[PDB]
Design a protein around this ligand. Sequence first.
Ligand SMILES: Cc1c(C(=O)NCC2CCC2)cnn1C
Length: 435
Amino acid sequence: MSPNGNLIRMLVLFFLESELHEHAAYLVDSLWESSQELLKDWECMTELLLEEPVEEAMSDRQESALIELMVCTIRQAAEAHPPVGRGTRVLTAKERKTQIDDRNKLTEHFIITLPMLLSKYSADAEKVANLLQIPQYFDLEIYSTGRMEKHLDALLKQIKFVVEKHVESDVLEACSKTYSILCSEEYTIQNRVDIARSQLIDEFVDRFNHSVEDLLQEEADDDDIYNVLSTLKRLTSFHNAHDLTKWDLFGNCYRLLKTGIEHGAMPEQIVVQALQCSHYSILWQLVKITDGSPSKEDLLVLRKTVKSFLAVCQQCLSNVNTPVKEQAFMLLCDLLMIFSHQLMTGGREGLQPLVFNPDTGLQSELLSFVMDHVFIDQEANKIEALHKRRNLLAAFSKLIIYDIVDMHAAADIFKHYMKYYNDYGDIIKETLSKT
Ligand SMILES: Cc1c(C(=O)NCC2CCC2)cnn1C
């Protein structure tokens, strides 16, 4: 009770203090067979996290590590298998019984305590993002079963406060996914969550629209910039998993971008976010048009939107800020692949009016960016910046394979940059073998 308290407090200390386990997930997994009883004492953990001390308090770093370990135990209990990259998966009657009982315990416990955890740690971006990994493991039918409506209201309150207080992409994405899970995965609670979600979106679209209007009518203030960026960030996060097309966000993103090209003075993050949001609008417009039975004018309206946006992304390759170029480049390489002839697979030849062939100018600009921003002369930031350039090339590779860009001009560039491997590689290879 307080015994298990010491053992957990020390488990959190051994984790942080030794570099004998890099990953909380792997520490939890390794101890799982020997210490399941302890590692599922969630009452003990939430008590450590929520109580005020008598003596000796927990540090921010140990609080963070307990939350990260707690969430790892919640996963392992619910999935009843080792974590990704310790796998090898057929449960006994008693493992299956233990899994169901564990899912019941952690659901009842965290429906009650997760709102309290979010309240207390509301301002800490890393902690909140970790805590919001918990609902995915809930047996959500229990929100009805337990007359537990009061606690669903409480989580929704706390997600609203979190979304309202934060702009970090991890927090916002955690919030987006938590609404997604609450809605479409039990009818009983669907209607209540939909109401809270659309009210949250409503308040954010209003503040966004008023801020767009402020920024563009305006001399332009650092307040004007913050208001546009901050609200657009929230809406961009949600627009991936939530269909926000009912709110015409593409229209205002389009003005922000047109303004940024014309007068060349739109802050980089507003352009990047505006590009992402516009993209998510278009992808959702496309899904409604596939699944529907769309008319001629339906198709020709989505086309005008998509051609106007392809134009914007092209112009944005010329933006001074490389984060804009990369965003514009990534979207060009997605959209040119989606609105390719592929779109007329699975008996969907109705969509022909939506098909796009990039002109010469665009193909050449998509070649330039590869030469200038994938293949560059010159810690942790650099393994990350390299995986990105890999993804940019890989995205662009797909266009080459299906002849959407000039596949010869592309390989000419791959020649140029591989030369030293094709000129000296064998000699370098065998040299390095004998050392
Ligand atoms: C097999 C190989 C070579 C090679 O055969 N080099 C000779 C050619 C350069 C002009 C003639 C270089 N890189 N790798 C991988």
